[model samples]
Target: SHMADRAHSYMTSVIGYYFGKSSRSCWRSNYPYDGKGYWDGDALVWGQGGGLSAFVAMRDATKESEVENLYGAMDDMMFKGIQYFCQLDRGILAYSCYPAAGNERFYDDNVWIGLDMVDWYTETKEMRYLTQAKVVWRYLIDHGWDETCGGGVHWRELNEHTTSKHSCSTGPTAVMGCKMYLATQEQEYLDWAIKCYDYMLDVLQDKSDHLFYDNVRPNKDDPNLPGDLEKNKYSYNSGQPLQAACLLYKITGEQKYLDEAYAIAESCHKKWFMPYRSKELNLTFNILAPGHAWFNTIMCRGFFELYSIDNDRKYIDDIEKSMIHAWSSSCHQGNNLLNDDDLRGGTTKTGWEILHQGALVELYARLAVLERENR
Candidate 1:
């Protein structure tokens, strides 16, 4: 089918354009394609985003040995950079682990890595990755907690200016805590998860839609003074809370969490789903109309997680239908590369970003997994 071909073609372009050095190494751009990020040619991934995607891709690859080779290269690169990112303060990971350059640490970035490590532990049945995730979570607890904005995890390090509490950071952190609880059967993890979610609902989520705000903080100079609410409704912010809620529902069998999950899913559909109609062909199809590749993938995965708990075929069907249209219409068939917009097959404003490309890798890989399971 055209849908399958388009997905395969996009995969090819990602390999040629966005990936380099190691088949597993995700670069921010193609060689000599200078625009948003540089290319000599490695993002050098700096860890979490690319590493996590590589793990997912490898798991789904039919040619496991070939993909394993890619994972091997990724392992080498990550091991080399690990020392650069590990901080003395609670041993938290930084945004980037450049050999000579320093990078700011964010609870947002580290929390994803922590969750990734937990998943990695699940895959390999390795205790060390679990231990590391625990350490990262500890660092987050110590440094990220605050009383301002009615108590939640701070987005960035203490030294940074953006003291805002973000759903991006908080939601995933809650999900991570719940995941840890399931992984270890430890009660404290569940306790932390509930604490984080309660704070998120009180301070970050818009009560009307159950959708999330981007972040909230006081005035830049005066920490005590209130500032405008960051009412920007992006896809990832909504998706993460949905993930956290569904996971909570799964573990606790709590009806409230399930209700919240449904509320969030419905709200996401209202805000993000834009039906595309082709006047040329007199046809219509489904797609997530807003956000670039990275943001949309977060929502896609969130929908899948919800489907898992509720056994909802509509969620999976919508995702597949959307991707099919995106593959058929938006993908640049010749090069196999995709732009930010799914409705129109065009180039992104800022060339190709590594995280964006990695997100697509995740989407495709997970879809393949879904396909196999259904078969």
Candidate 2:
């Protein structure tokens, strides 16, 4: 009953806040006609799906109207996200949308093709979207991936020398790219994913340590640089390498990726997912929201893969053990919304403070399927 109450309370508060105060619902949709488009309608959206936790919140509450509202917003945002970019050399993508401002340059080919396109295709069952995804996928390679710095990726196409190529950006794109490639049987996309994955492991991943950094500011690693782990760790960035490794192993069946995944897995649990964490459902519980959300989502993939390869169900049980804790709590507001730069100043808060609730959707969805199968 208490768990149910906690779940209910989390759903109500987060949904109320998302529609009431958040940017996703902050803008009213005003769709333009003439076969030419403009944003003008919706509930809550994110081609970026940052608000997906809210979507999950409403859905879990079984509030159909709320779910519809959450996804309806997603639909409009997705359209805008999918529609062409107006920037002069920037390829297909939504105008200054998610992950930042400016309606001009944000139309990311990598995220569009490698990420959202898959969800859109699955949602609409439209081959055209899938095809478009492929087109964007190809363009991203032409635009990014230097394969230098012992294997690094640029985050976004800010410009010639500018792009995020954040570990978080690089790895997920790779995982998504690999998934699309597998579905399409396209070796090129798969190869691209492999390239990105390998690149991150080469640089950010402290191979012997099994950890990753938040975002490497300019590849300027002076052998004389000073600072301990606190100066260079991000909750999610470190896990990306592991998640990427899992997806790679799933696709290639190569033991190397599996070994890599296992190493990172061991590292994360040892370092971050500690045995002693407060159970209070307050903002203090936050970590990297996107990373926390994504880590839980992807770690399952990693654990399951490891289990498949080693026939070790311990990994499966360990995942379930962690999920029991993850699903039982809710602390988002401070995680995604208010805790931006301040997140840097304090080691106490986590981005997961916000992302954890929404990301649980993917984990829950996956677990639901796994549950039925186990039954």
Candidate 3:
């Protein structure tokens, strides 16, 4: 319990200490260390590239002063952030953005802008954000929404994995579509969301265990890729099915959504956390763990939401442990940068990736307001 309190304190401190102090654009893709926390490129570029973590951080910062400072800044940050992937007319985000600053190329990156914009609009409540969000979705319909073979989404346009997709790629996009529909009252977004989820469910889940499969091929003729056949069957993938089900239930008031969410959470518990006794792994349960902070923070959000619905505290137990472990030792002293990549052991990068620090803020904010009898 004392560890819990320290976890809360440390989470807040990391964000409080760095939010405005660090230069956002110093993200690795854009700049190499130059001794000062100053940047030579776009001020709003906050990340070296298209950074999902910063957006998540601002969204979660309900009470923090750094977060409040970021609110107006977020509008501009998001406006341009989406522009990195979208054109305000097309509806999708590219999977990546090169030269995180001083560059405006959009087509080269694969599409996930649809994935991030809905979260931005929800966090900031800006219509342009929503407008940009819809545009990206429209693009998804045109290109990303797949039917190649028992189809769903494409991981990216490049590489051999074009027709192939996975739960980590499609599931969040499905939830994004569902969330956009709730925000706009548009049936298409919701419909797309459900369709995406179902397509993924049919392909991704292990029916015997209810654990979601990593990636799939629904028909025999599907163009198989190396990434397609290997199903990770992990916590992050399972996390979204619960998240989407709960949100869809809240929007539609369907008990079935909640029930489905519970079932998904059950699968998550039996499969991941029970076996996740150590803290030596990477994000998304991958050894590579791309977008580390962004992914883990959102995963934290999903677990906390489930905790509320299921009256379960265990959902947050590992979250608490991770937060404490992170706070106990994430950045080393004279660590002029945030984490470049995170595993149990990793090096620091320049600038605070809000995604990197955002999850701790999330856990701390939740713990701060929770009713404690002793307090």
Candidate 4:
């Protein structure tokens, strides 16, 4: 009963404030038809993709009428944001739209936007959103795919001058590819999805721990060795691949994908999935281990994707615990919004803080919605 109330209050306050105050602080680019967007938050400028993701979540969690008031604002948000960020030389999506700032095409960033496009299509039933997802997926296979890391998606464009492979990039691509396959029922998408999975499993996954590492680049010490894997494990890395595998099993009824899916989930639990207290706020709770606002929410969703397939309570429970903790501990402050940033100088610290915190709102709101539905 208490959680149900918390869930409702969280949605009312966050959805209210986000559409109310946050929208009022947005800045648009001078570039024509330019939706190259970012949010001017309380002393912070946030990334485009992060903020859009929050909108997608908000739209899904709250009723259509509740969010319809902001649809006019959201139109500009999606248009300029997608055009500037998604449009590239060969329809390749880049990370940020600000050419004046940093406009490099990070594979992870592109994939994030791509995945969000799929979410938008699902929420709004807009064909163009799915079409945009395919555009970026093609670019990934075209430019980012190569045999450098024994056939994995490169972390950046070929022009970025690196042959490194990252779990963040490959795993999500697998999930995205599978999502497309399901939406269209195409065979080639499944093949691409599997390719992404195999490369991640072979190159990035630490078979011993079952936990995925960050990236694999050319080994500096041993020139003959194929790659020197960065030992840094991230929450979303494990999640993307895990969701990909689960979806594969769901589609093909294949035991192999199911086996790997459970294995990764098990490893994630043993390693990255644990509860800790935020000393600054003095609140104890479980999250996907990565403390970053936006990325961590992405990581938590990985488990829920699997849970949805098997109807597992633990997965849903873990998700709710983290979401509730976020709402209760961090978001209960002034304005009833979650702010996850350690601000630097006047130039501002995270170009992603507003977006990521907004994402957290979506995560909690979705979980809250689920809680009510089940009740």
Candidate 5:
């Protein structure tokens, strides 16, 4: 499949450009190495987590029989290279920006890593991955969750100053709870999943568009007082809720959950995508709203889940066309790496970032799986 091929190429390109052999870990930042040493500073945990996610998607799309070597390589990179980000001390298990202790830990970062661990468990039924995921869940609930703004998780670990409860934190936490429930058949996980999902819908989602706001910060003086809502909308903020709804629907066989998922999918499509024309390519294509690449990739996860059940190609077809246009028109012609702006014409950046490249890998790989499954 063309999508799978693109995924493979992107995966290899990422490893080639970012993965440093001498340091045995990804570079902390972008490409075009000036011989500053690959291990100069550890890659941010978020982007490394995204890279691991891409590897998982690629693993799902390919068969072990055909790609045994590739599988082994991925394992080596993940276990040996990316493992630098994991911090087990400080009485909690989580990945941080750098390997150093006492680094700032974000709840959303842990959620992404935990979700990837759950994906690994789902794919291989590995107890270790599930155990690691459970540790992350425990950390978030214990440290990140509080009675702020009624009930929701904070965006980051509590400090005297941390005040915001974010959709980025809570929405994916709900999705993680759903995944945990599916993995363990535990009623507690499902219950918590519902709690978090409902909290987001009640407090963060815009009733008019069904799109979610960024975060809500409660009054510092009083926790129960009405807080200010940051009304900025992002694709992944709604994406997690969409995915959680679909998962809940799958688990409980409830029509409401499906309806909610459909509503979010429809609204996100309307808000986050548009048509684009390329003079150089002499063609027009769909393009997603300009945003962080990994955020949009996370958004596509929801679309893929909905498509699996509803068999609706409209949403993903748009995504496919957007990615195609990005590849054909937006990437650097020399290295074929995509830019941060998906619609930036033929202009390419001097250095490509890790998360951006990883998102493309995951998107293409997941799309390939979707295509093959439907075919």
Candidate 6:
């Protein structure tokens, strides 16, 4: 219950501090609010997607706790505040960096938004949300995926300029594909899910650690052949595939999928989490490694899903400890907004980013849901 309350409170702070009303009601790019009319170019589509996902998670948390008032408020915020970023023209029919139509469209950004839309659809059984999600799926199918590097989604919509097929892009699309299959029972969606998952395994995974690499670029001369590997790894990159594995296991009842899920889950926990001492708070915590908050939040979704079936608390317990330590020691002084300490180690900081703040809302809300289910 306290986690749910903190999730609501933190989300309220995020909206109050980052959302700007000047020109139009939209989320600002950062805290201490900047840009003309406090609007830093409408917060970018990526961050806006994170903000909307926070609302979706908060909505679920409120529903679990029967906090109908907050649930309704979160719903209104999604439709009214976050929906401003949705770009419907130019036949693209996806979200953009700004409210404008011609802004650079990122496939990763749209997939995040699409995933949340699907979440909303699942919760409410509303056709409109599902329709919007299908539009995103269609856009990705028509544009994001190509024969490049065998098969994977391009990082951005401008395919010519983008040479790399990103784990960030492909992993989430697989997860999205799995969700779509679960929702509609469409064989096409399941096939796409398998395709995306196999591509990651074939091209992007690091054999040494069983963790995923960042991206794979096509050869400069021969675009079909795989070239340089980005090599760097992030939690969400592995996280999405881990989630897709769990979903595949659930869908097909296959041992290989479950084994794949466990492998990624175990490897990621080792790679992304560590024991840390917070001198300022006089506490030691088993916390996530310093990185992107939203990225780790995405990763945690897989852990939560695995927990649903396996009933293992090891992964989630570590995450909960990290969140608690973050809340206790990492909040800004006045607004109680979280600093980048969860993304960086504990530091005395005042400002915050919208995506980072929104991430905690999703995490705490999800944790609350988990707590309720266990009870």
Q: Which numbered prediction scores highest in lDDT against the true structure?
A: 6
| Candidate 3 lDDT tens digits, 1-375 | 353344334443543443333333222322332444333332232232234444343344443433355445545644543354232222224333332332332221322355456666776686876776676566566666666656677554432234556676677767777778877888878888888778767777777766676766545544532234555666667777767777777677878778777777766655444332335333322121324554455455566666766667766665555543444445322442335255233555565544345443545445443423222
TM-score of each: 0.82, 0.62, 0.68, 0.78, 0.92, 0.92
3 versus 6: better TM-score goes to: 6
lDDT of 6 by residue, 105-221 (tens): 788988998898898888778787888889889878887899987779888663234868999889888999999998999999999989999999999999787789998989788
lDDT of each: 0.65, 0.48, 0.52, 0.64, 0.79, 0.79
- The positional error of residue 346 in candidate 3, measured at the CA in angstroms, is 11
CA deviation > 4 Å runs, candidate 4: 1-46, 63-76, 90-102, 219-225, 275-290, 339-352
Instruction: List, residue by residue over 173-214, the lDDT tens digit for candidate 2.
Output: 677677687677778878878877766675556756777764
Using alpha carbons, what is the TM-score of model 6?
0.92
- Pitting candidate 2 against candidate 4, the one with the higher lDDT is 4
**Over 4 Å off, model 5:** 21-27, 34-39, 158-161, 278-285, 330-332
Clash totals for all candidate models: 0, 25, 16, 1, 0, 0
Predict model 1's lDDT versus the native.
0.65
> 120-205, model 5: which lDDT tens digit per residue?
88877768788878878987788778787878888766223376889998999999999999999988889888988998999999
Model 3 lDDT at residue 12: 39
lDDT of 1 by residue, 142-186 (tens): 777666666678776734536677888888888889889989999
lDDT of 6 at 374: 63
lDDT (C-alpha) at residue 361 in model 3: 51
lDDT of 1 at 300: 70
Taking the tens digit of each residue's C-alpha lDDT, what string does model 4 give over 82-136? 4543435444444444422344456666777777778778777778888877777
